[PDB]
Amino acid sequence: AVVKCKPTSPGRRHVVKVVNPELHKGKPFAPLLEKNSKSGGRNNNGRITTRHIGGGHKQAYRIVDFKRNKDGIPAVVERLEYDPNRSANIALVLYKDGERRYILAPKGLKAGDQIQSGVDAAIKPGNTLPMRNIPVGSTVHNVEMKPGKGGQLARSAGTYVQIVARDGAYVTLRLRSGEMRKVEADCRATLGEVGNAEHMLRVLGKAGAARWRGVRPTVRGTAMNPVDHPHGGGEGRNFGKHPVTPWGVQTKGKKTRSNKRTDKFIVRRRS
Amino acid sequence: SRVCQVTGKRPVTGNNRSHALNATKRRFLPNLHSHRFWVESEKRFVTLRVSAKGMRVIDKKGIDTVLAELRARGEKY
């Protein structure tokens, strides 16, 4: 549920929260954590490669199960947690034999409902089963690309991927962008839309609400000097040139896809 | 490194001469390919990083004469 914050100061004027009361108000499960040190957008050479990353609140990596291998063992959701690494809330599942894991929580999955992976998993949200066993037309998430690799499609806050067709060995997936990608029918796919569907309804509201997430400020190009960006210069505000990246590559329309290996798995691009 | 193991090739540096003879230094890289060769006397595959000249040579001398050079040269395979 969203909460429009009352304007008791500028910078609380526009803040729209996402108050989820289902989330656990306590410590996470300590065996499933590991260190997530920040990098600032800097590779092994030390140079800034990706810009506008740095700062923000410290985080710890939750070891989330994307591969979802424990076949034929039912698991019950113990609580829902807030995950700083991603936009979907995660769910501490307790299997019957005693192993605890996290999964990406689906849309309606709250604490108590029993989930189960495998090949014979009952078709209801939470259950992961290979896409030759999922009926054509349903909405799955956490979809793999290669079998046994781990979920890679529809893994964000409120995204889902429809299985539009099954022709033999591959299933055609109407992905979340509109792209129709063929993934093999042996790949796992967790049923149901993924949970935190109102994540796009939040408003950060103030400038330092993005610095909390590690979003350093984005200086637009037409302010810089001509040595700094192609959009530099001007004795005023001048922009008499076609909009390019800081490295000359066109932005406003130019398709920069260079993967000719996997053009075969792509029925259509997006619109 | 860009060294064909068989023929000992190596990137040589010449010039990108243009229509007005402007000389900018370039490199001629060899046509190296990492290939699994069937050594019939060992019945295992030896991966030699070999050019495309050096696969004409292996198809001529035979792989057991070529790998009898790479020991005497002192090179691993």
């Binding site: 090949v119 014979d120 | 069937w38 019939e40 696969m55 198809d59 035979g62």
Partner: protein, 149 residues
């Protein structure tokens, strides 16, 4: 690539021909599977004089055990027990090693690279013809039953 042959290949010659092949077809398929020797002047005399008919002693006792890998399998009673759902809808699909584990227990201790499947999945419960290529010359017809668990 002038190459010599040691077994009949389907569309270029029999044992003991000096056939022009494309130089990657000998380098990747003919010589690494032992169907050929590169036709050097030292390997012409090694074969066309010595083993011109001495290989027919060996390449025919290679296929003498072909029927001894086939004709003794005149029982044709093979059953694989895999879990299904209901009225088909198979939980555990039968592969080629799954056939070559129940042809294994019933008859020949057979390699898994021989099982030729027109479907490859055998998902639907029922009888299915499972032909073999246990040598490249004489083929088999054993029909394997899938029975529900």
């Amino acid at each position: 690539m002038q190459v010599i042959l040691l077994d009949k290949v389907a569309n270029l010659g029999s044992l003991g021909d000096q056939v022009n092949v494309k130089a990657g077809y000998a380098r990747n398929f003919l010589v690494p599977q032992g169907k050929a020797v590169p036709a050097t002047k030292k390997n012409i005399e090694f074969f066309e004089a010595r083993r011109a008919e001495l290989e027919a002693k060996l390449a025919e006792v290679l296929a003498a055990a072909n029927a001894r890998a086939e004709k003794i399998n005149a029982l044709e009673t093979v059953t694989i027990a895999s879990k299904a759902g209901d009225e088909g809808k198979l939980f555990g699909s039968i592969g080629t090693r799954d056939i070559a584990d129940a042809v294994t227990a019933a008859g020949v201790e057979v390699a898994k690279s021989e099982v030729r499947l027109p479907n490859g999945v055998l998902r639907t419960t029922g009888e299915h013809e499972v032909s073999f290529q246990v040598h490249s010359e004489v083929f088999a017809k054993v029909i394997v039953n899938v029975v529900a668990e």
